[PDB]
Design a protein around this ligand. Structure first.
Ligand SMILES: *[C@@H]1O[C@H](CO)[C@@H](O[C@@H]2O[C@H](CO)[C@@H](O[C@H]3O[C@H](CO)[C@@H](O)[C@H](O[C@H]4O[C@H](CO)[C@@H](O)[C@H](O)[C@@H]4O)[C@@H]3O)[C@H](O)[C@H]2NC(C)=O)[C@H](O)[C@H]1NC(C)=O
Ligand SMILES: *[C@@H]1O[C@H](CO)[C@@H](O[C@@H]2O[C@H](CO)[C@@H](O[C@@H]3O[C@H](CO)[C@@H](O)[C@H](O)[C@@H]3O)[C@H](O)[C@H]2NC(C)=O)[C@H](O)[C@H]1NC(C)=O
Ligand SMILES: *[C@@H]1O[C@H](CO)[C@@H](O[C@@H]2O[C@H](CO)[C@@H](O)[C@H](O)[C@H]2NC(C)=O)[C@H](O)[C@H]1NC(C)=O
Ligand SMILES: *[C@@H]1O[C@H](CO)[C@@H](O[C@@H]2O[C@H](CO)[C@@H](O)[C@H](O)[C@H]2NC(C)=O)[C@H](O)[C@H]1NC(C)=O
Ligand SMILES: *[C@@H]1O[C@H](CO)[C@@H](O)[C@H](O)[C@H]1NC(C)=O
Ligand SMILES: *[C@@H]1O[C@H](CO)[C@@H](O)[C@H](O)[C@H]1NC(C)=O
Ligand SMILES: *[C@@H]1O[C@H](CO)[C@@H](O)[C@H](O)[C@H]1NC(C)=O
Length: 168
């Protein structure tokens, strides 16, 4: 029962960024003879850590790994974007009680100001120099559709909305 982890945790990234898919727990552990399936098609890498450089739209997809005598892992979907702002989430579905992290991410990692996170059309938090909103113990009320606004350079921009569910 293998589980694909990501680092950064962000599973929605901008074009050109880099992310690493570890076929297990911590990056302190290593292993050989691992299988990667991007969109179902077997990959050419075997290292348990499958890196991804200058993300191309084609990198968007369903990924999973498997071992010599083990059933393949639950798939993980990575989506690549091109836009001024991207709302990132630790996890899109969360079990009542777990942590939840949202991050208003600016293109090319630039800086964003006058940031405001929105939940269900309502203003929620506001900061000059942006900050990633975080939650330790998650309520079920926190489920909702988020999106953030911010000013980049000197213009205002709105992000794609993102639904989030907290089950119990
Ligand atoms: C595994 O399956 C995935 C399907 O979910 C594949 O991802 C899809 O990949 C295609 C091709 O890169 C991507 O389409 C892109 O190509 C368009 C023309 O080149 C480009 O214009 C699109 O982006 C822009 O245009 C659309 C329409 O106006 C906008 O909606 C976009 O926001 C943007 O402005 C686009 O990038 C698909 O989008 C992408 N699907 C998803 C859900 O992202 C993987 O390629 C496949 N893996 C492999 C290796 O085959
Ligand atoms: C994702 O990882 C890759 C690779 O580690 C990073 O790409 C690197 O990008 C720099 C540009 O910042 C490249 O070097 C620069 O090239 C220009 C022009 O050739 C030169 O003027 C600079 O002085 C510098 O040498 C570098 O080649 C490239 N590395 C590789 C291996 O391709 C990338 O930055 C990472 N993504 C992010 C968002 O950081
Ligand atoms: C092969 O996978 C290992 C992890 O299993 C990757 O190793 C990490 O590499 C960085 C430097 O690139 C080290 O600082 C880390 O300590 C390493 N971690 C471990 C667990 O050894 C390695 O990058 C992968 N190799 C390739 C070419 O993708
Ligand atoms: C996020 O979920 C919301 C509902 O919580 C979706 O919005 C509504 O979806 C229902 C589905 O039939 C429609 O009747 C409403 O008109 C939708 N409202 C709006 C303003 O779109 C929303 O589509 C979901 N978004 C994603 C990305 O799944
Ligand atoms: C492993 O896969 C087999 C079928 O290939 C399935 O019967 C079995 O339940 C799986 N292992 C676990 C722990 O579920
Ligand atoms: C922790 O989570 C449980 C349910 O998941 C809830 O009853 C409790 O109030 C939460 N703690 C806080 C501070 O919200
Ligand atoms: C918030 O964003 C910063 C980028 O400067 C990042 O280093 C940090 O890990 C993020 N914080 C959280 C709680 O994820």
């Amino acid at each position: 029962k293998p589980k694909v982890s990501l680092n950064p945790p962000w599973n929605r990234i901008f074009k050109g960024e880099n992310v690493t898919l570890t076929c297990n727990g911590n990056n302190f552990f290593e292993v050989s003879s691992t299988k990667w399936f991007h969109n179902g098609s077997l990959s050419e890498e075997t290292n348990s850590s499958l890196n991804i450089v200058n993300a191309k739209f084609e990198d968007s997809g369903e990924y999973k790994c498997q071992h010599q005598q083990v059933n393949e892992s639950e798939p993980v979907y990575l989506e690549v974007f091109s836009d001024w702002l991207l709302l990132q989430a630790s996890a899109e579905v969360v079990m009542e009680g777990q942590p939840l992290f949202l991050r208003c991410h600016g293109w090319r990692n630039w800086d964003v100001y006058k940031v405001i996170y929105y939940k269900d059309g309502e203003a929620l938090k506001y900061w000059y120099e942006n900050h990633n909103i975080s939650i330790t113990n998650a309520t079920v009320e926190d489920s909702g559709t988020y999106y953030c606004t911010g000013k980049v350079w000197q213009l205002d921009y709105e992000s794609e909305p993102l639904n989030i569910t907290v089950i119990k």
